[PDB]
Amino acid sequence: STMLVAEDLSAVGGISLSSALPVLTAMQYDVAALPTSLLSTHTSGYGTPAVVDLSTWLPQVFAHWTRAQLHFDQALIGYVGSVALCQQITTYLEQQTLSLLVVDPVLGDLGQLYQGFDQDYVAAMRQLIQQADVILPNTTEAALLTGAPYQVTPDLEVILPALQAQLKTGAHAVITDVQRADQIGCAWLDEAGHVQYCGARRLPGHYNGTGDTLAAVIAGLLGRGYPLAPTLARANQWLNMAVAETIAQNRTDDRQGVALGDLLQAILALNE
């Protein structure tokens, strides 16, 4: 099958689209790799990157694909970056008949919207997520989506249903960076409306591209028919492993995204 992946491409950095590609390809997908933005390097640690504004390009891309009669099976949407691009993506996706749409609602972290994002971006995001089968906000994002003031540990019994209220029936809101004791992981509502959690032991440090890889792995697994719970279980273990690998490399450069070798190996093994 074919998966559309629409997110930022940084030439240097090993995150987002650059990490999605190997991952998804190895997971047996033909990837339609669509940059929403093109950068010299990611935005953390290399100084101001050189960036291409793709706002006038994506409409052309979509128009083209349309006339060419291309149809996508699955879609993963990551970092978009502008109100207009979200709008464009939203309508394009509406035209497709997707069996799977996963949207990582990139908006912020540590209680605040990322620089450049305002409440207009937030509203644009709320529109984009309306058809999503799964959304993967972090704790800050969840709050922003619902309009609840940020809480470091929000009440999952409250925020989860609130989020679900914005999604279609049967879709799922999964909060991704939930910390419980020495664990870090994902929380969501099961079919009976009960809060579930699946985590792995938190490792020291902070890494780039973790969210990106998590999203790719989740899309990929779901795309292949794995129920949500087992998907989340595996994704978390896989990320844990990737971060472990990363530490193991004893890197001198803390900017490069999470290592993928072990992850690719795991994917190949699952494949048989």
Ligand X SMILES: Nc1ncnc2c1ncn2[C@@H]1O[C@H](COP(=O)(O)OP(=O)(O)OP(=O)(O)O)[C@@H](O)[C@H]1O
Q: Which positions lie near ligand X, rule CB under 6 A?
A: 109, 138, 176-177, 184-186, 200, 202-203, 205, 207-212, 214, 236, 239-240, 243
Contacting residue, 41, 74, 138, 146, with Mg ion by CB under 5 A? 138
Minimum gap (Å) between residue 263 Cβ and ligand X: 12
- Binding partner of residue 198 among ligand X, Mg ion, none, CB cut-off 5 to 8 Å per kind: none
* Structure token digits, residue 136: 């993967």
Measured from the CB atom, is 74 or 236 closer to ligand X? 236
C-alpha 106/C-alpha 153 separation (Å) is 19
The residue sitting closest to ligand X, measured at its beta carbon, is 211
Contacting residue, 13, 78, 108, 211, with Mg ion by CB under 5 A? 211
Minimum gap (Å) between residue 235 Cβ and ligand X: 7
- Binding partner of residue 184 among ligand X, Mg ion, none, CB cut-off 5 to 8 Å per kind: ligand X
Residue whose C-alpha is closest to residue 255's, from 11, 9, 13: 13
Measured from the CB atom, is 96 or 231 closer to Mg ion? 231
Give whole-number Cα distances, 259 to 186, 201, 219, in Å: 21, 18, 19
Minimum gap (Å) between residue 183 Cβ and ligand X: 9
Assess 16 for contact with Mg ion (CB under 5 A): no
Query: Assign residue 236 a region: left if phi > 0, alpha if psi is -120 to 50, beta otherwise?
Result: alpha
Measured from the CB atom, is 35 or 108 closer to ligand X? 108
Minimum gap (Å) between residue 262 Cβ and Mg ion: 21
13 three-state secondary structure: coil
Contact 82, 55 (CB under 8 A): yes
Rounded to the nearest 10 degrees, the angle between the axes of helix 261-271 and helix 16-26 is 30
> HEC profile for 93-143?
HHHCCCCEEEECCCCEECCEECCCCCHHHHHHHHHHHHHCCEECCCHHHHH
Give the footprint of Mg ion on this chain (CB under 5 A): 138, 211
